[PDB]
Amino acid sequence: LLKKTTGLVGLAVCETPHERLKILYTKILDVLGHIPKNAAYRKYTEQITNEKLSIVKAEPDVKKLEEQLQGGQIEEVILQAENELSLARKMIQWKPWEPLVEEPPASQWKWPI
Amino acid sequence: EMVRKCDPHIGLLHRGTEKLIEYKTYLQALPYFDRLDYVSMMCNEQAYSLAVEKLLNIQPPPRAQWIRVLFGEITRLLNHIMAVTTHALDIGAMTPFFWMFEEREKMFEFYERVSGARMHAAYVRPGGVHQDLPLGLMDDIYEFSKNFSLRIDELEEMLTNNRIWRNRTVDIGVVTAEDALNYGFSGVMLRGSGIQWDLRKTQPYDVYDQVEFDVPIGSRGDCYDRYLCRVEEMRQSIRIISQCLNKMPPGEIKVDDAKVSPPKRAEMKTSMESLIHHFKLYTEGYQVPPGATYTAIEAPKGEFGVYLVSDGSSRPYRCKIKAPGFAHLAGLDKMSKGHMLADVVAIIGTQDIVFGEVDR
Amino acid sequence: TYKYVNLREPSMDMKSVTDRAAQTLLWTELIRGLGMTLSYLFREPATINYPFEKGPLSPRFRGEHALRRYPSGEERCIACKLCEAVCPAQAITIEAEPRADGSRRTTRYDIDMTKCIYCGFCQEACPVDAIVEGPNFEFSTETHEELLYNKEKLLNNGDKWEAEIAANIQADYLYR
Amino acid sequence: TSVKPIFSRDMNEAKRRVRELYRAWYREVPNTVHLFQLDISVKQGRDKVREMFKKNAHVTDPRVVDLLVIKGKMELEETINVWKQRTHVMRFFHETEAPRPKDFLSKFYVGHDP
Amino acid sequence: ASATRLIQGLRNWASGRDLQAKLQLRYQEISKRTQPPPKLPVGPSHRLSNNYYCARDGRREAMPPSIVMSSQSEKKAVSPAPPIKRWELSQDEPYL
Amino acid sequence: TRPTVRPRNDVAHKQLSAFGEYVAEILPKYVQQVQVSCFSELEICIHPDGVIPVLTFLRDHSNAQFKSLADLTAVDIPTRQNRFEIVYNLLSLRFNSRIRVKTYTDELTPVESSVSVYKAANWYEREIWDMFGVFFANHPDLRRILTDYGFEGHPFRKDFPLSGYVELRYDDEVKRVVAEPVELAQEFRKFDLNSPWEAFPAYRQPPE
Amino acid sequence: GVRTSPTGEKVTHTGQVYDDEDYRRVRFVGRQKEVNENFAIDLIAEQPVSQVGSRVISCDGGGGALGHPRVYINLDKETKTGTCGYCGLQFRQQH
Amino acid sequence: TQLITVDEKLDITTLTGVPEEHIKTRKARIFVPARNNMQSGVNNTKKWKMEFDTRERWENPLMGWASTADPLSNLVLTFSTKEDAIAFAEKNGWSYDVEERKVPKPKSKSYGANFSWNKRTRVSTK
Amino acid sequence: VKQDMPPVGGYGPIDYKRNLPRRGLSGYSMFAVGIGALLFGYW
Amino acid sequence: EDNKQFFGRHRWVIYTTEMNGKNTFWDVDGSMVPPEWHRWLHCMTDDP
């Protein structure tokens, strides 16, 4: 359709969103490959990004992809995919699947006091 | 003439409202919310009464829900007149400032007739409203609201198509969609930048689900989009007021749980239980169960939320007031980067900044 | 349910372009503003002539506090201290003792009008309608201590304004 | 007993930061006196700075003196720019305050305050 | 409303809209300042039978918050809520 | 039950409990408690050492998208050893959700600043210092924002009195406004209004 | 009717008169002491005693909702007339 | 390691901003409040309270209110346990005294003893 | 009973849409009038 | 009273030239109205 404006300021119109989304999802998969499999974050994020890769691969149209991905405009999907890739890099660096660092005191979350 | 750093200093009106709430009961803390935003006086109590009723696990009667929306929407006409006209006063066009003040004086009589005060009504209370509308009040609302559509077109004529107003407005105060969300912005800030977000449509409260209206959103995120969104919100307020006047249901104005809302004066002088409950409610106050909640409404400035914490007694443990203008002033350094020193009187203008709720 | 304000694409034809050029050169919208100002010059102004004219007010109006009396000469207040307990500004100070005939009456009823926020909690918490937020509003004083009312000033205010406070409460009490 | 430090790992780093803050305050005091057209001399202001620094000197917790260093640095930064008035600078000199009784006899004469 | 016809004509020409049909000054069309006394209705619990407070105890129905996890299989990844529907354009005035 | 009691929501309770379980099982390093209130509000009590990652997760996950920051509230409870309760409120626009993240912190130990997650907190926690003394490390510009410049102490702490320790009055001898010890014309009358009877049986603490 | 203490200062209905050695009377010189000339006990002292024929009477102050809450007075004791606690009116049984 | 072993005394008296006159001449009192004898309720006797001694309050020369000069007269704090209140008292440098929790002793009640055959605990009337 | 109620037929319709008059002479005609005034003054 | 004028200006008062011994030929006051007329002036009720 070659949408003139995406409706949001600072968000330029992506002329080729299909290859961009596919390369972002594959990059997310390669980044998530290094996470150990027993972490639930790897399983959950791999599942949702594989579902998103399947739905973005099985349809050529852009308007139906926007209306059935439930992510708003396809540029918003690209932005949230980039943010999820940044999250995957940060969780690679941070390793949050380890056990609890410190137990709280017994009277810490007791309300009312 | 140009700007790279603009650091505002606040605290000139710091009264410490949210500490004084801790030493007063829930009913005694109700007039405090009137004086936080003194141009949205009747909208802040709707946020506080929704917080107490959520903790108390009660709901207002159906007649009380329509009154709060009707007088909430008349306060949007209160606030947005202060928004545009003082923004025009700061820029320099003083002519429509006095035109709308006669209209704002006319809706001050509506506040005085139902509650008794022009500004600080203390009308909306947890459990309903304090008093009913006087007889023939809604007849006077309709005859005023019929003629109010000309005044918005009167105000729009001298400002929208004016080339002098446009040249001060069309390219100063531009945000993007992503940085507006990260800056805690709400209200016209998100709507002006093109983000579709309105609390009355997504997370509705008392009877806003039933009514039908439109949410005007911007195209470029400049000050001119934020001026047009404020003028169009006057039109949608008239649309709600016309709907509310024809769909006011019968019933009581207060919740019939007399342990929360006080009983009537005729029944407190005849029944024993009504006199006991009148004694404890006006001296001790009702016991709010422990639990922390964050209830946010759509104020005309933005998202107004109250974080209320109850310790089990009749007094709040902690009552944080979230100001829509507090986060809006936090972005002022980024707002005026690269603009001229005379543009800050318009960048302050396009955000509904009132120094009562900013400094608490 | 959402409308695009300021998303009207201007016409690119010769007619609209020439009309916009004529608007820019001939100041046509400025002429419209001049015409609106001329039309709003000739209207009758809404200026009421104070103090010879007064603004419209309601019988529920909250103003100067006053202490009422029964229609037998006895003071209405029974020193129950509900108004000083409900007062959000703590402007009301009550000190009481049993008087000569054994009736429970006040000895000191002080209202700090510089402290009071005129919220009307005392006029609704009072079980005998003793204290009333009366209709008076023209009581500005030249000295700070003249706004610190004792029991005698409030009783004088009640005796002065009872002839209209009784009518107002008679017209209003069915809403309470 | 193991805690997370703020800026200083031990007492020596906190002492060094105390030294640096005192050096900056001693640099600023003549400029502060001249800027606000103060009635005090330079040495009186430096004596006041020393008197605060020695009044707040009986605490040995590194985190406590680190927080006090941070608060003193905020005070120094607020005096760097023209953010305070003459009143906020002159508040440290309790001049209009009447001198309270200190010995037991005068405190007995004036009231019940111990 | 008491303005003369030539002043009304000049005013209507200068404004471009009919100003007498919608006057901003209030007149005798307003409601009167005195009203007949009203009789308010009662609430839904103004009853003499089956009106026990335990059947409508709103305050006492509160519960402590349910501890989902405390520190003393292949389920799908779950969002806090279903995603929001796309807003539809206003058919009354889309402003396009 | 029907007319005068607020109706209860159960599908929102189920969805919030499911997302709380998902969050608690996706970040086991820092989460300590997850609770869903009776009025369908989700609260996550996490360790202070995970103030940065967890919120960053909620900023950037595909299934959370908590883009907006609503509140940054400090609650002072003197009966605990970590007397300060720092509470973040997050709003997700895509899924239309609200979440609450709670952490504990005493007077001396600092907490890492959340400026890089949400820039609005760049002001908010600043006010927290000006009201509580909770130091926020790596803050860009942390100073007082609401109180007076010569103000000593933090007002919102529960041991701080209602009226302050100093009052301002103008003196003609020094031609200046000056601070004096507080002497009220009338003492603030403390009203004992706590009921001696139990109000809610479901909220009863077990005996010692 | 008010009284007159011999310092020249009027007497309030409570009974508050500044002494001869009280300096606070300097706040009155050049001005006036505002008192109430209608004493409540003297105004109710001239009210007649209502004679009824019932053992239990009910008083609400007159006007219904504009008076004090309704209170029941027992008139069994013929020695003392039953006086209402709110309005101060007193009722007497004929028997 | 990012952790430092500090065994120093937990004292924050210089951080609270209190003047010295109100941290050395005041007596903090930690106690369980007594039950009001006109009521049978005991819900107010479940939490420890911290209070300060009453200072001088005089009469206003103008109009007669209770004018005070003590800023901590309306400062009463609530604590769940005794040791936490003791820690909070030691933390702010207040000299403090503690009164123990006066629990009521378990009485022995019997309805039949009002109608005993020979004991002195008979009821004279009912 | 008696309370503040809308009339049994409801209130009348209330206008809320934007309504601006829009008025003009054409630019070509205005420039022709200016040219005519110029030539008359010059003559 | 003049009911043809717009609301606010329809009722008005001309003050006396002497009230309680004060020569008030020019000095008019807003509190110079007895309560029975203070009802009618400020539009408490329609009945004088």
Ligand code: SF4
């Ligand atoms: S109106 Fe309100 S603030 Fe004023 S005295 Fe009455 S209760 Fe107090």
Ligand code: SF4
């Ligand atoms: S509420 Fe009324 S009766 Fe009670 S003390 Fe106050 S004025 Fe007197």
Ligand SMILES: [Zn+2]
């Ligand atoms: Zn009586």
